[PDB]
Design a protein around this ligand. Structure first.
Ligand SMILES: Nc1ncnc2c1ncn2[C@@H]1O[C@H](CSCC[C@H](N)C(=O)O)[C@@H](O)[C@H]1O
Ligand SMILES: Nc1ncnc2c1ncn2[C@@H]1O[C@H](CSCC[C@H](N)C(=O)O)[C@@H](O)[C@H]1O
Ligand SMILES: Nc1cncn1[C@@H]1O[C@H](COP(=O)(O)O)[C@@H](O)[C@H]1O
Ligand SMILES: Nc1cncn1[C@@H]1O[C@H](COP(=O)(O)O)[C@@H](O)[C@H]1O
Ligand code: SF4
Ligand code: SF4
Ligand SMILES: [Cl-]
Ligand SMILES: [Cl-]
Ligand SMILES: [Fe+2]
Ligand SMILES: [Fe+2]
Lengths: 520, 520
């Protein structure tokens, strides 16, 4: 019974917003789905602006956990009977599931389009049947670009209470998925509390706990230990597993001349084991057995990039792309068993090398969703790697990357705290939305337009309410002009009343009203 | 006699760094030039790492001002006699000036290459002969990407003391130029203190003070008022003027259907005057007279973009590109009189629209240096516009933009303070360097490689010392591991000792020492 403390309220974080749900009926089952969104209430005769909402149910006691909203969906499918439980299996049968309709509604797209994307392997809906608390979401290039927030303890830092806070906090600010990457104490328990209290998909990297199960002795890992860890985590409801099955024995020497070696945590663990025994990666060898596990729960596979580059020097090297080729093989094998797959990508990559990454992944991995860690576009600014990587994430997102794993200001320096989690999520929501705009994703610009209209019209509170982080925008403005009257002033302190360009435009257009721009 | 207060010392900001100078001789004159750089002193047998340095002379009493290092250069050229005083004039005569050699040295490139770039109009060296305190620098696509920091008061906020602090502070963190954009009290005096204490080029937007000279009544502007303002500012040493001479009367109606209208401060002032009189822009009409002024001092012209887009909605519209076409005409006219020119660019531009901006500017403006305000890649995150725009700035920098005007976290909200200035400069140094890497600019990656080598080798203090902001990186690490011993630990709190991937790689390579990767 951890001493859980509440995050700041939705209302504190998003003034003028309300949580809403769109009700739709899943016709085959008759199940009524309540698909979340937020509504930003505006002034001056503007219609309210509806936006995406990952924050999940609010004010729920963490000792009790979230409502098991998917229970009737899972129970009905079990009673009907099925050989496999994955969204890809259902999609290939021509079945539109509750999860697919929920995602279609959430994305403002057709349910058949969702089904098609999942069936062809170009989108995934990470949704383990044991994660009944989940509000379904979809990851794929044809959908909104999504953001993952990484949390979890280490042996050096944090606690159960703080990690649960961090999941609620990450999702408040826009995280679409989270991963519990705990490598310290109480791994199982920490994850249980998180899953029961997470409305978003939860991923893990099972090799971390497997290594803990053998007391940090990598040589004592093997398939059997790993298999038991997979089943344990699947039973709790983990929606996706990062598995570094492309770190093949023969690829390891390709890293010998790298500047920063193997920087992947899981990748380095597999490499250590492979070298210790001179034997092929056991997750690769047992790929089919992993697929059998995934089929029973619907755990999606996030095929790791254990040989990703950890420095600009190492970007796009032979080791990295050898693994990418194998990720594609593993992807196609998974699809033969109807297991949902995404592929993990780099890393530290300078901007001119970003296009090659997307081109090769799209081709070699048959358009499976891509899931990048950034990339960081330069190594020079630890303390600011949310910015160095927002540049790369936005770029690779624009080229088609479906899920952007965040990077916080603590990257390369220490375990992120709750403040760093917020900073990382905001930077990544910026990158993801900038990518949506670059892709001309339907209706993405409506958000920018609503805020910009409020800006031009000096509807200051509306401007703040429409932004990613309303209280930051408001407090920043108020540092110089805190008075209530300034919230309707046609200027701010940047230019002052006589040099505000939008006020000058306002006067210009007023002058032009009577007959136009043609008279003195 | 303002109450000037010192910025934190170079040593506080950059532990393990020293300010150094490379001495070179200007052969025609015999003048000895002392070209600044910094040297980062490293451990473990690494050679010291030399980097660029804009911070200028340190610990100089602002009441006294900086040494007039260029005095002998200017005096000698005056004694020789010349019809025009610009670096472009000298370059076209085949003359390598002190300024050109200084820049060549600072860029590690050949002085003839610098001369060629300036002569052809593809680079500028903003260096008014009255700014004797200036350490010369070059702006151009063939050189390091540069950053401008905007400072200055408004009628609502700040003071002379604070603005001088901000210039010293901006340059400490890497600003390559600054602009004094004051629109409040004491404009002339504020600028005088800044120029006498600035080792970097100082730009202004003369129409702001011209409008102040006529008490904010735009209708009382005219060429004569503007001309007197130009001469006043030139006499003080302003190195470049933003002049919105492309805001033509006939382009103004093209803005009528824009979401955010005319967002340029200077552009809106010119538009108001043009509409008031139904007369062509007086700066356009008197372009030749402006060139005559610039020739006598070497003031470079930064041709404004008064019709830049101020929202994603307005990006790449007819008004914006009409002005760009005119900027090209004005550029070619300026070159006929040997006046140095750069062109100002957008703005708010979504990523997919960035390439068109560069393509049209390179063609229509004959490769003159481009100088962008960002661009911001989305409107959704006021409070974080240093990040929304770092993405655009890095992108457009990669495509060839030579000078990136910073955007601080206070953009759209209020006047930036000293903290915001630092945040903006750091974000922009990231964008500029990421662009240098993307362009494969010679030796740019050496910086990333040195930091990444320190990272892999757990030379923590070296890693911090090599970064853009050493004390931030150090303090962030120390939030979880503050002990001195942690500065040599082969892990940090992110992974802890047993999950650090670089330590695992370290052990892996140690194992492989005896004979290789082929044995169990
Ligand atoms: N407990 C945790 N909380 C938040 N992020 C974590 C985490 N454990 C691992 N991560 C993420 O996983 C990464 C692996 S450790 C270092 C990886 C390396 N910097 C690289 O370039 O890939 C971390 O840097 C962090 O981004
Ligand atoms: N005194 C000052 N200090 C710092 N930046 C200034 C400044 N005066 C003007 N600026 C810069 O010039 C801009 C003009 S005012 C608003 C411009 C608008 N946001 C746009 O998209 O172009 C400011 O936003 C700021 O970026
Ligand atoms: N998204 C991504 C791409 N490459 C790595 N990651 C993420 O990085 C984390 C740690 O992975 P690893 O064990 O490979 O270092 C996990 O969150 C994983 O999804
Ligand atoms: N670099 C740039 C490109 N477009 C505008 N700017 C900068 O924006 C500021 C204000 O310009 P304006 O008067 O056009 O709003 C000046 O610093 C100018 O160089
Ligand atoms: S004063 Fe300047 S920064 Fe403030 S609202 Fe007006 S145009 Fe924007
Ligand atoms: S513990 Fe993880 S984050 Fe820290 S130095 Fe090692 S690899 Fe990097
Ligand atoms: Cl690291
Ligand atoms: Cl604004
Ligand atoms: Fe890294
Ligand atoms: Fe703007």
């Amino acid at each position: 019974s951890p001493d859980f403390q509440p995050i700041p309220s939705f209302e504190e974080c998003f003034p003028k917003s309300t949580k809403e749900h769109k009700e739709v009926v899943h016709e085959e089952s008759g199940h009524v789905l309540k698909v979340p969104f937020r509504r930003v209430h505006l002034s001056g005769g503007e219609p309210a602006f509806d936006n995406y909402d990952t924050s999940g149910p609010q004010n729920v006691n963490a000792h009790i956990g979230l409502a098991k909203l998917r229970k009737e969906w899972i129970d009905r499918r079990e009673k009907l009977g099925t050989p496999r439980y994955t969204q890809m299996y259902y999609a290939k049968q021509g079945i539109i599931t509750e999860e697919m309709l929920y995602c279609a509604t959430r994305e403002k797209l057709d349910p058949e389009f969702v089904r098609s994307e999942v069936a062809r392997g170009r989108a995934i809906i990470p949704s383990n049947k044991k994660h009944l608390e989940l509000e379904p979401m979809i990851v794929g290039r044809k959908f909104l670009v999504k953001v993952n927030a990484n949390i979890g303890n280490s042996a050096v830092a944090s606690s159960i209470e703080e990690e649960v806070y961090k999941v609620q906090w990450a999702t408040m600010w826009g995280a679409d998925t989270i991963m519990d990457l705990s490598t310290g104490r109480h791994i199982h328990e920490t994850r249980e509390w998180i899953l029961r209290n997470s409305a978003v998909p939860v991923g893990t990297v099972p090799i971390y706990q497997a290594l803990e199960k053998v007391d940090g002795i990598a040589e004592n890992l093997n398939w059997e230990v790993f298999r038991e860890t997979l089943i344990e985590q699947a039973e709790q409801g983990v929606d996706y597993f990062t598995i570094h099955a492309g770190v093949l024995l023969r690829y390891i020497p390709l890293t010998a001349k790298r500047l920063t070696g193997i920087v992947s945590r899981g990748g380095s663990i597999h490499a250590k084991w492979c070298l210790a025994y001179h034997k092929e990666n056991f997750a690769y060898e047992h790929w089919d057995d992993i697929l059998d596990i995934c089929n029973q729960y619907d755990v999606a596979l996030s095929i790791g990039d254990g040989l990703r580059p950890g420095s600009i020097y190492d970007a796009n090297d032979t080791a990295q792309f050898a693994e990418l080729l194998t990720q594609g093989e593993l992807t196609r094998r998974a699809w033969e068993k109807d297991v949902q797959v995404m592929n993990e990508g780099p890393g530290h990559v300078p901007m001119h090398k970003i296009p090659e990454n997307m081109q090769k992944q799209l081709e070699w991995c048959n358009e499976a969703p891509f899931y990048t860690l950034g990339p960081l576009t330069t190594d020079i600014a630890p303390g600011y790697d949310h910015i160095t990587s927002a540049i790369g994430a936005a770029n690779i997102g624009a080229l088609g990357t479906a899920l952007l794993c965040y990077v916080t200001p603590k990257e390369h320096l220490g375990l992120p705290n709750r403040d760093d989690v917020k900073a990382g999520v905001i930077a990544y929501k910026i990158a993801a939305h900038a990518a949506d705009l670059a892709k001309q994703h339907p209706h993405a610009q409506a958000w920018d337009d609503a805020l910009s209209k409020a800006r031009f019209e000096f509807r200051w509170m509306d401007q703040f309410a429409l932004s990613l982080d309303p209280m930051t925008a408001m407090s920043f403005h108020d540092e110089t002009l805190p008075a209530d009257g300034a919230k309707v002033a046609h200027f701010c302190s940047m230019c002052g009343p006589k040099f505000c360009s939008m006020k000058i435009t306002e006067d210009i257009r007023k002058y032009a009203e009577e007959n136009g721009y043609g008279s003195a």
